[PDB]
Amino acid sequence: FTVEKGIYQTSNFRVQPTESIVRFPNITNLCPFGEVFNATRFASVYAWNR
Amino acid sequence: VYSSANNCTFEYVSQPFLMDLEGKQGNFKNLREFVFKNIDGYFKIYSKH
Ligand SMILES: *[C@@H]1O[C@H](CO)[C@@H](O)[C@H](O)[C@H]1NC(C)=O
Ligand SMILES: *[C@@H]1O[C@H](CO)[C@@H](O)[C@H](O)[C@H]1NC(C)=O
Ligand SMILES: *[C@@H]1O[C@H](CO)[C@@H](O)[C@H](O)[C@H]1NC(C)=O
């Protein structure tokens, strides 16, 4: 109950963030994969194109 | 280099590169190094001229 002159550490100061921005891509993107849906010929079901 | 292919999944085209088809017998002027690695199914290519 009695406090003398000096410095006493009570707690810690926390700067909580206010915003949360996340950006994985920059724009729309696509790598060539339509050849399996646009091939000259397809495969059968006994041996299908994985 | 081959006769024909049967079936596959991956086909990638890199950036265009120009070459000279003339062959000579003189001293070399460039050095090219390549490193090919295979970790957990991932092929790695490292190179510098
Ligand atoms: C992402 O797309 C924008 C708009 O096309 C472009 O300015 C930026 O350079 C791109 N970033 C890349 C390709 O890393
Ligand atoms: C296949 O080719 C046709 C004609 O070139 C095109 O209209 C179509 O968008 C392509 N893709 C699919 C999934 O049909
Ligand atoms: C298609 O390729 C897969 C491997 O990517 C293979 O297992 C399958 O047998 C192939 N199908 C044909 C018809 O060659």
Rounded Cα–Cα distance for residues B44 and B36 (Å) = 6
Q: What kind of experiment solved this structure?
A: cryo-EM
b/e code A10-49 from CB counts within 10 Å (16+ = b): eeeeeeeeeeeeeeeeeeeeeeeeeeeeeeeeeeeeeeee
Cα end-to-end distance, chain B, whole Å: 26
Answer whether B12's CB lies under 8 Å from B22's CB. Answer: no
Which residues of B are less than 8 Å from A43 in CB distance? 7
Strand partners, B47: B34
SS3 label, residue B23 = coil
Q: Identify the H or E element spanning B35.
A: strand B33-39
Distance from CA of A49 to the nearest CA of B (A): 7
* Most ligand 2 atoms within 8 A of CB, residue of A38, A41, A42 to mutate: A38
Distance CA B34, CA B36 (A): 7
- Distance from C-alpha of B33 to C-alpha of B49, rounded to nearest angstrom: 7
Q: Can you tell me whether residue B45 is helix, strand or coil?
A: strand
Taking the C-alpha atoms of residue B5 and residue B46, their distance in angstroms, rounded to an integer, is 28
